[PDB]
């Protein structure tokens, strides 16, 4: 089957990329260092930015369940690519360290 193009990221609860899987190069055309330290919202279409902020805020409330969101991500060629980001929190219960968010980011079609 045709494998979907995806990459994994880790974010703090504000949305900042704190880890970027190198499969990002094939997905969106950036090197990981171009994403690290930036907010995901800095790559998001203006119409979708608030949804994306809202999403990151709610995923922390949903008891580790998956929260997905579709949005337009600006590729390295400055083109809007539809992304489905499926996010969940990870908190290690041997600790009280703050949870972070794990995402899997897939190029998808905006169609049925």
């Amino acid at each position: 089957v045709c494998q979907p193009t995806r990459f994994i990221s880790r974010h703090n609860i504000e949305g900042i990329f704190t880890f970027v899987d190198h499969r990002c190069v094939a997905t969106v055309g950036y090197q990981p260092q171009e994403l690290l330290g930036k907010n995901i919202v800095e790559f998001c279409h203006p119409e979708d930015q608030q949804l994306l902020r809202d999403s990151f805020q709610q995923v922390v409330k949903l008891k580790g369940q998956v929260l997905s969101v579709m949005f337009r991500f600006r590729s390295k060629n400055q083109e809007w690519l539809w992304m489905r980001t499926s996010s969940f929190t990870f908190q290690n219960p041997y600790s009280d360290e703050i949870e972070y968010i794990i995402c899997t980011n897939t190029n998808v079609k905006n169609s049925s």
Partner: protein, 108 residues
């Protein structure tokens, strides 16, 4: 003594538990390079005494969408095993995400 993140590695799998991605943290912990795990099933590395339980957990993951494994043993590259526990999550099915936390040093 290690901090929490240095004992955590994320792995991604197809629905048959073959590795499709793994964090490089695994190398320092268990010995493997991520590249060498790709295409191998996680089942190849579970201790025999945990294999039936890990099958059951995989079935539970596939039915429910998320699972916590309980404690199990994973085979290290240079023999022996480490104790670890895994939070698994299915992404839609597209893949399984596993957050793996090492509980022990390598034991023979």
């Amino acid at each position: 003594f290690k901090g929490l993140d240095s004992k955590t590695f994320l792995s991604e799998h197809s629905m048959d538990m073959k590795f499709t991605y793994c964090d490089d943290r695994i190398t320092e912990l268990i010995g493997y390079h991520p590249e060498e795990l790709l295409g191998r099933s996680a089942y190849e590395f579970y201790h025999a005494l945990d294999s039936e339980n890990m099958t059951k957990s995989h079935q539970n993951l596939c039915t429910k969408g998320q699972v916590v494994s309980g404690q199990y043993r994973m085979l290290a590259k240079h023999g022996g095993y480490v104790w670890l526990e895994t939070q698994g999550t299915v992404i839609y099915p597209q893949c399984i995400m596993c957050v793996n936390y090492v509980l022990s040093e390598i034991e023979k």
